[PDB]
Structure 1
Amino acid sequence: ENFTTNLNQLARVGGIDPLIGREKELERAIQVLCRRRKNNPLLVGESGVGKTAIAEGLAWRIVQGDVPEVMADCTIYSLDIGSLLAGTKYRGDFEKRFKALLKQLEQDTNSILFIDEIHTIIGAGAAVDAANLIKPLLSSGKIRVIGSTTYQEFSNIFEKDRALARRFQKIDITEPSIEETVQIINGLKPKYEAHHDVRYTAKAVRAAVELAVKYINDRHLPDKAIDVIDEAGARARLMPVSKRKKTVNVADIESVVARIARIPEKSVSQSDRDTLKNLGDRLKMLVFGQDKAIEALTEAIKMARAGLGHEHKPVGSFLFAGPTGVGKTEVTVQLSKALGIELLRFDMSEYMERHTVSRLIGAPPGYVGFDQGGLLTDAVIKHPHAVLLLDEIEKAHPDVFNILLQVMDNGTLTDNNGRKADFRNVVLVMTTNAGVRETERKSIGLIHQDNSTDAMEEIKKIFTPEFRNRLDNIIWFDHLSTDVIHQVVDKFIVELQVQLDQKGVSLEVSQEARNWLAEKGYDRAMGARPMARVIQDNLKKPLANELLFGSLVDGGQVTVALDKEKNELTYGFQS
C-alpha cells in the first residue's frame, strides 16, 4: 500500500479538480468494470488528452455515490512504477514487490488497480521489465486493472499478444472539441484564479485554445490550454513588481505562448488583419524584384484568406513559373520568414521514380512503427500551418499528378498510415523551369524563328487541363531588367561588408566594378544562380588570400577598379 496511493481517499480530502465532460467515456468504463469477465479496462489515448484524469473522475463518482451499489463501496489505487523500481537494481526484485502488493489488494475485494502508462511495464518496447505478473492477475479475474496506454506502442504490445488484448477492452479516448475544451477551462477557472486572485476574461481563455493548437502543434490542446493559462496567471502575479495587475487580457496570453513557441510576438499574436495588411510591404522591403508578380500575388493572398465561402479546399494553390532562380524560391522563403512559419522543401525531380512516389506516402522497406512513414505526409502532420515548396514539378511521373488533384479537390489525403491532414490551412507553391527551356532551343531551319510562346499554352503541354480551372491565378516571370540586377549586386556585397565589419577591416568597391559584375554573373537561361558563383570566386579568392598573409592582415582599406582596355578587375590594398 505504501507504493500506491489511494485516489478514493484523496478525493475525500480534496485536491482533485472536478471533471467536466467525457460523460460517455466515463460511463463506458463503469459498464466494463461491472463485467463478469474481461472487466479490466484499457484507455487508448494520446499524451495530454486527459486519459489519466478520466480515471480519477471515477473515484470521485464513488465518493459522490452516483454509481451502482456494486461499485459504491469499491476503491481505486494508482500503481507507482517509480516506487517499485526505486533501488532494486536487479530484474526480479521489482517483481517481488508487485506480488506482495497484489496479495494485499487480493484480500480486500472491490479493489481496482489503475496502472498508469501500462505500456512501460509490459512488452519489450523500443527504449527493462519482465511483464510476467500482469498476465496472471488478468486471467484470475480477482482485481480489475485500469491500464492507460498510448495509441503508439499499443499496436506493437497489445495487438501482437492475445492474452493481454483478450482480457482488456479498448476505449478510444479522443481529444476534446474546441467547444468542449473551453468549457473545461471554465470549470477549472475557480481553482487557478483562487491561487493568484486574477480574473480571466472569456475572450482570452477561448483564444488560448484556438491559438495553441494553431501554433504549438506539439501536444494535444487540453494539456496546452492549462499550461498557458497557469503560466499567464503565474506571470501576471509577479510580472509588475510595483503594480498588481489583477486583470488579464489577450496581450498577456500572447507573450506567454510566444516564449514557448520561440516565434516573434507579432506573428504569434492574433494580428491576422495587421499582418495581411502589411504582407506586401514587409515582403517588398527585403526583395524589390518582380513587383508586378508581388502585387498580383499579394492581393491573391488577402482574398484567399477570406475563402470566398469555400474553406474545405486548400487556401493556397498558386503556381509560379519562369526562368530558374529569378525569384521563384526567394518569394516563398521570404513569405514564410515574414509570417514566421517553418518552410518545407521537396524537390519533385528527386521524386521522379515510382519507388520514390511510395516514399512520399510511405516506406518501401519494412519499418517498425512506421515512424518515418511518408516523407511529405508526415511533415504535413508535423507542421500543418506551413507552406509546401515543390521544385521541378514538370519532371514528375504522371501518377504523382493524380495525387495532387485530390489534395486541391478532396482536401484530404489518405496513405498507408492513415493519418489525416487538414489541407484547409495548408498552402502550396510550385516552380516550373520548362518554359525557359522552350525559348532556349533553336528551330530546325535555315533562319531561326521567334520562340516566344504564350505561358498558358506551355502549361497545357506539361500539365493536365483539370488544374488551371481549380487554380486562383497564374503568375509568370518573363525575365529581369538591367535596373533590377544592378541594384541586387549592391545588396549582395553588403553581406561581405557586414562579414568584414566584424573582422575589423573595411572595403571599398568602385561603381564601375558593380556594373561589370552584373552583366557577366546574370544569365537569362540560369537567372541569377550563376551570379553567386561568379561574384564569390571573383571577390572572395583575392581578398581571402591577402587577408591571411599580406598587408591586409589588419586595417583593410582596399580599393577595386577595372581598366577600360583590359576590361578586367584590379585589386588595390593599403596596409
Structure 2
Amino acid sequence: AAVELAVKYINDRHLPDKAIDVIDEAGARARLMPVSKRKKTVNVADIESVVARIARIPEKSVSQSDRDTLKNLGDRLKMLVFGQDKAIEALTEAIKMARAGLGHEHKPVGSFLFAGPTGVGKTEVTVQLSKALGIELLRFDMSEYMERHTVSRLIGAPPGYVGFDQGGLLTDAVIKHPHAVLLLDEIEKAHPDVFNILLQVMDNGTLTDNNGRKADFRNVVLVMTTNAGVRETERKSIGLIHQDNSTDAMEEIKKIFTPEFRNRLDNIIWFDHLSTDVIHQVVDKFIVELQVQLDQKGVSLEVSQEARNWLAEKGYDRAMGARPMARVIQDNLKKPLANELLFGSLVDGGQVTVALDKEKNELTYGF
C-alpha cells in the first residue's frame, strides 16, 4: 500500500525514493507513537495516514468530527441558501463521495457548471460551501480573461519572457492549497480559448504551468457559475402562452461550450427562480445581517412580521432574483437608520423598532 500510494499520490518525486520516504516517516512516527508506550507494527492504515500527511490530502476521517461536518453539510448550507436544494445536494454528494473513497480516479472532486437566472444563489452557495467546509476558496473572476492571450496569466509566461518569474495565477493558487474550492466566476465571459485549459483540468485533473510543475486538481471542487442565456430567460415570448426559456438557455450553453467540454462536466445544475416563500426567507436573512451590522455599533433592532411581509411584497421580482431585495431593505431601513445614527437620536444607543401601518403603508421607528 505504501508503494501504491506513493505512486498515485506523490507525483513530484520519483519511485524508489518516495516509497522509502513513506516507510521511513511511518517508522519514525510509530517510534514517536509511544506516547502511551504504544509501539506496534506499521499497518496499512498508518501508511495511509503518513501518505495523506505528505501529499496534503484528506485521509480516512470517518472517526472524526469531519463525519459530522459532512453529515449536516446539506442542512447547514440550506440555512444560508434558500431554495436551490438540488445544487446543494449535488455538491454535498460529490464531496461525500470524494471523502468516502468512492471518488474519481484522476478527476477533480467535482466540476459543476452552475447556470441559471440572475440574482439567485449561484456564486453565493460556492462561497458558503468554502466557508462551511473551512477550506480555502480560490476565486477567479473569469471576466478579466476576455483576451485570448490571457492564458499566459493563468499558467504563466513561457521560458524566455518577462513574466516568467511570476508564474501562473491558477496553477500557483492550486499548488498552494491543493484542497480547495475553485470558483471560476462568470465563466462565459472568458475567451473560448480559455475553456481548453479546463478541458484537461477536468478530464485528467492536472495542469502544467510554464516551469513544468504539475498542478494537482484531484482535491479541488471546480465550480463555474455562468449567465449563458440569461437575456433569453428574462424575455417574454410572443404568443398567448409565455414559454419556459430554461431549455433555450441550455441550448445556449451547448452553443457556447464545445461538446468535449460539456461531456466531462459532472452536472449542469440549472438554478431556478426564487419563489415567494424563498423571498421571505431571503428578507429574514438580510434582516439578520443588518441586525449584526447594527449590534456592531451597539444598536438593537426588531421588525414586525407584517413589516417583513410588506418588504417582501415591495421588493419581490422573480426576473431579477434576490439582489433587489437587498436594495429594498436598504432603501427602507438603512437610510432612516443611517440618518438617525450619524446625526440623530441613535448615537451610542439603539433599541429601534419597526412596524407597518395598514392605512398608510409606512414604517415606524424610534429609540
Q: Structure 1 length as normaliser, TM-score? A: 0.50
Separation in 2, partners of 1:566, 1:225 = 77
Question: In the TM superposition, what is the alpha-carbon distance from 1:475 to its structure 2 partner?
Answer: 1.6
Q: Could you report, residue by residue, the CA deviation over 1:16-69 in whole angstroms, capped at 9, with x for unpaired residues?
A: xxxxxxxxxxxxxxxxxxxxxxxxxxxxxxxxxxxxxxxxxxxxxxxxxxxxxx
Change (3 A) 1:334 1:295: same
Distance change (3 Å), C-alpha of 1:212 and 1:274: farther
Q: Is the 8 A contact 2:114 2:269 kept in 1?
A: yes
Change (3 A) 1:556 1:252: farther
With the length of structure 2 as denominator, give the TM-score of the two structures. 0.75
Is 1:479–1:524's contact at 8 Å kept on the other side of the alignment?
A: yes
CA 1:538 to 1:277, structure 2 compared with 1: closer, same or farther past 3 Å? same
Bigger mean CA offset, 263-272 vs 358-367: 263-272
Q: Name 2:182's counterpart in structure 1.
A: 388
- In the superposition, relative to structure 1, how do residues 339 and 557 fare at CA in structure 2: closer, same or farther (>3 Å)? closer
What secondary structure, in the 3-state scheme, does the structure 2 residue paired with 1:242 have? coil
Shift of 1:535: 1.7
CA contact (8 A) 2:158 2:164 kept: no
Distance 1:304 1:317 in 2: 12
RMSD (CA atoms)? 5.5
The aligned residue for residue 337 of structure 2 is: 543
2:45 corresponds to which of 231, 243, 251? 251
- Asked if 1:364 corresponds to 2:158, the answer is yes
Contact 1:504/1:556 (<8 A) preserved: yes
Alpha-carbon offset, residue 486 of structure 1: 0.4
Deviation string, structure 1 residues 158-179 (Cα, Å, up to 9, x no partner)? xxxxxxxxxxxxxxxxxxxxxx
1:264-311 Cα distance to aligned partner (Å, 9 max, x none): 999999665554333323333444432233234433433355675741
User: Does residue 427 of structure 1 match 2:221?
Assistant: yes
Mean CA deviation greater in 519-528 or 332-341? 519-528
Choose from 479, 484, 492 the match for 2:273: 479
Hey, what's the Cα distance between the residues in 1 that align with 2:181 and 2:199?
18
Structure 1 208/499 Cα, relative in aligned 2: closer, same or farther at 3 Å?
Answer: farther
Structure 1 residues 551, 475: CA separation in 2 closer, same or farther (over 3 Å shift)?
A: same
Q: Is the 8 A contact 2:117 2:321 kept in 1?
A: yes
Q: Is the 8 A contact 2:299 2:348 kept in 1?
A: yes
Q: Which residue of 2 aligns with 1:172?
A: none
1:318 maps to 2:112: yes
**483 and 225 in structure 1: CA distance in 2 versus 1, 3 angstrom threshold:** farther
Alpha-carbon distance in 2 for matches of 1:239, 1:354: 54
Q: Does the CA-based 8 Å contact 2:143-2:186 persist in structure 1?
A: yes
- Is the CA contact 1:237–1:246 (under 8 Å) kept in the aligned structure 2? no
How far off its partner does 1:209 sit? 14
* Contact 1:267–1:340 under 8 Å retained in 2: no
1:257–1:268 CA contact under 8 A, matched in 2: no
| TM-aligned CA distance change 1:233 to 1:444, over 3 Å | same
Contact 1:512 1:561 in 2 (8 A): yes
Mark the CA change 1:537 to 1:249 in structure 2 (over 3 Å): closer, same or farther.
Answer: farther
Contact persistence 2:107–2:202 (CA under 8 A): yes
User: Is the partner of 2:126 in helix, strand or coil?
Assistant: helix
Aligned to 1:354: 148
Distance apart, 1:379 and its partner CA:
1.2
Alpha-carbon displacement from aligned partner over 1:225-263 (angstroms, at most 9, x marks no partner): 999999999999999999999999999999999999999
Distance 1:308 1:458, change over 3 A: farther
Per-residue deviation, residues 183-217 of structure 1 (Å, max 9, x unmatched)? xxxxxxxxxxxxxxxxxxxxxxxx99999999999
Within 2, Cα distance between the matches of 1:444 and 1:229? Answer: 70
Deviation track 1:341-398 (CA, whole Å, cap 9, x = no partner) reads: 1001112211111232322222499876834221212211121211110111122222
Alpha-carbon distance in structure 1 between the residues aligned to 2:126 and 2:33: 38
- Residues 302-359 of structure 1 deviation map (CA, whole Å, 9 limit, x = unaligned): 3355675741122311221112331112221122222211001112211111232322
Runs of at least 5 residues in structure 2 that lack an aligned partner in the other structure: none
Task: From the superposition, tell whether residues 555 and 255 of structure 1 become closer, same or farther in structure 2 (CA, over 3 Å).
Answer: farther
Q: More displaced, 267-276 or 305-314? A: 267-276
Q: State the Cα distance separating 1:444 from its structure 2 match.
A: 6.9
> Which one is further off, 314-323 or 249-258?
249-258
Q: Describe the SS at the equivalent of 1:297.
A: helix
How far did 1:410 drift?
3.2
Structure whose alpha-carbon radius of gyration is higher: 1
Q: CA deviation at 1:425?
A: 1.9
- Matched residue SS, 1:318: strand
Distance 1:335 1:514, change over 3 A: same
* Alignment check: 8 A CA contact 1:325 1:529 kept: yes
The answer to whether the 8 A contact 1:455-1:476 is kept is no
- CA gap 1:313/1:229 in 2 versus in 1, 3 angstroms: closer
| Structure 1 residues 241 and 302: CA distance shift in structure 2, 3 A | closer
Q: Indicate if the aligned counterparts of 2:178 and 2:219 stay in contact, CA closer than 8 A.
A: yes
1:441 CA drift (Å)? 2.8
Alignment pair present for 1:511 and 2:305: yes
Distance 1:510-1:471 versus aligned 2 partners, 3 A rule: same
Report the CA distance shift for 1:513/1:236 in structure 2 as closer, same or farther (over 3 A): farther
Identity, % of aligned positions = 100
How far apart, in 2, do the equivalents of 1:425 and 1:470 lie? 16
Match of 1:233 among 19, 22, 27: 27
Q: Helix, strand or coil for the counterpart of 1:454?
A: helix
Deviation at residue 489 of structure 1 after TM alignment: 1.5
SS in 2 for 1:434: coil
**Paired residues, what number?**
367
In structure 1, distance between residues paired with 2:56 and 2:209 = 32
Give the SS at the match of 1:443. coil
In 2, the alpha carbon distance for the partners of 1:565 and 1:211 equals 72
In structure 1, distance between residues paired with 2:216 and 2:341: 54
Q: 1:286 aligns with which of 58, 80, 84?
A: 80
Partner of 2:282: 488
Whether the 8 Å CA contact 2:98–2:104 is kept in 1: the answer is no
